[PDB]
């Protein structure tokens, strides 16, 4: 068998609050900061990144480069040849993390505002550290079906599962590139876990903190995993009448299996 060919796609890189990895002001001098910016729909190079086979991420022929290996320093654009090559190498993980192998630090957006300077931080699997290479500048709106065929629904600040109904906007969830799950009625709020301990009731809270408790991944086995805690989304005691969705260790019983519908 031939080894799979490794292509070099050209994509945008979407992250916190759906903003795009952006080379500030379209300037390409060495050291110019990379930022979050509203996603464009044109062919401007400063938001289109080439994922090359040498694990470098390039816009307009120059590399996405970390300034240093300490948590807190910013990420810039730079000549791929004249920069420290270890500072230009990046791994893109299936769980949404973009890591620099030399430093083990993670591309992050410590603020959710337009123009935020991108930095490298210690991995805590937060929303501020979630990314997705794509050309889709909008999140995917979906219904989440779970135990007994019921649908996840949001009311005020609470979340539970009720009978499915197409006209219920409170049952529509937008899956953002940063790993957060947000109610369609209020894209400023997130499916949030209070603590990293078991049987913590999940709520609907503001995405402001962009915390580890607000980042989720749909696993191949049907579970919705909170990466930092390692706990999964659980219909407590398999009883929807409790109106409690919680974090709980993975065990695979039907009260932990979900499915995103279109």
């Amino acid at each position, epitope marked *: 068998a031939d080894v799979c060919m490794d292509p070099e796609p050209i994509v945008r890189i979407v992250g916190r609050n759906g903003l795009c990895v952006d080379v500030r002001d379209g300037r390409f001098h060495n050291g110019n900061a990379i930022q979050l910016w509203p996603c464009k729909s044109n062919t401007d190079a400063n938001q289109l990144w080439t994922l090359k086979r040498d694990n470098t991420i390039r816009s307009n022929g120059k590399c996405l480069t970390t300034y240093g290996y300490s948590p807190g320093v910013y990420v810039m654009i730079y000549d791929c040849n004249t920069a420290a090559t270890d500072a230009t190498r990046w791994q893109i993980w299936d769980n949404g993390t973009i890591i620099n192998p030399r430093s083990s630090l993670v591309l992050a957006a410590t603020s959710g505002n337009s123009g935020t300077t991108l930095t490298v931080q210690t991995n805590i699997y937060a929303v501020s550290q979630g990314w997705l290479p794509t050309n889709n500048t909008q999140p995917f709106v979906t219904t989440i079906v779970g135990l007994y065929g019921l649908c996840l629904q949001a009311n005020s600040g609470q979340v539970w599962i009720e009978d499915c109904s197409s006209e219920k906007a409170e049952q529509q969830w937008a899956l953002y590139a940063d790993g957060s799950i947000r109610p369609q009625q209020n894209r400023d709020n997130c499916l949030t876990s209070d603590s990293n301990i078991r*049987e913590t009731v999940v709520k609907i809270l503001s995405c402001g903190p962009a915390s580890s408790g607000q980042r989720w991944m749909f696993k191949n086995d049907g579970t919705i995993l909170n990466l930092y805690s390692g706990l999964v989304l659980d219909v*407590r*005691a*398999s*009883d929807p*009448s409790l109106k409690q969705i919680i974090l709980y260790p993975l065990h695979g*019983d039907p009260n932990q299996i979900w499915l995103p519908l279109f």
Partner: nanobody
Amino acid sequence: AQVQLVESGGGLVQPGGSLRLSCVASGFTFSSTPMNWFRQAPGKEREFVAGVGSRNDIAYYADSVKGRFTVSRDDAKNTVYLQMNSLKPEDTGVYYCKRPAGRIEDELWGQGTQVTV
């Protein structure tokens, strides 16, 4: 329809005592079916107590009762257990075993057993 729960084992005990409640199911594949315990004190609402998944690995407990009760399952005997240790006056009530469901009409209760003090 013939699916039915028979709770048993409630009694009158004094604080610090212990009791094991048992509910025996019939009419369905008992294995893999989640089973939960509820209790309704005089005047108050039915409140969730504990619940077991497919294995005894999987157990959910209300805060009121952690570290004292143990929900248990014996698939061979079609039986759910609620071991009740270090009993308190606050635990008095009728204890119901329930098979939860998506619609409330498919919820499945037994007749409950009385626990006092």
